[PDB]
Amino acid sequence: MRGKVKWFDSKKGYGFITKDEGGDVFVHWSAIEMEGFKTLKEGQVVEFEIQEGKKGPQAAHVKVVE
Numbered sequence: 001m002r003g004k005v006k007w008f009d010s011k012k013g014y015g016f017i018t019k020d021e022g023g024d025v026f027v028h029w030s031a032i033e034m035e036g037f038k039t040l041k042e043g044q045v046v047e048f049e050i051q052e053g054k055k056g057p058q059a060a061h062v063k064v065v066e
Contacts, residue, residue, distance in 0.1 A: 002047040002065055008032075008040035015040055017048060017059050025050050025059050032062035040064070 003025070004018035013032020017025040017040075031048065032038050040046065040062070047063035 001049060002045055003059075005040045005042050005044045005046050008042045013038060013040075013059075013062055015042070017046060017062070019048075019050060025057055027059040027062060031059040034063060037064055038062070 003020055005015070006018050006024060007016040009015045010029050012029035013027055014029045015027045015032070017027055019025060032040060045065045047065050048059045049061045050057045051060050
């Protein structure tokens with residue numbers, strides 16, 4: 001539901017995130033797609049979820065926190 005932020009790319013929600021006290025994730029642009037305040041400073045705590053399938057775990061829902 002929340003992690004840390006390490007990298008933001010793409011004009012939408014692309015980049016790399018860090019789960020709470022875990023490791024690092026990835027993000028595509030449809031996980032950091034909000035209409036309030038989405039950007040990822042690359043060094044904060046976010047409010048997200050992650051799903052792992054045939055590939056690797058990526059953020060699907062990405063909000064911002066500190």
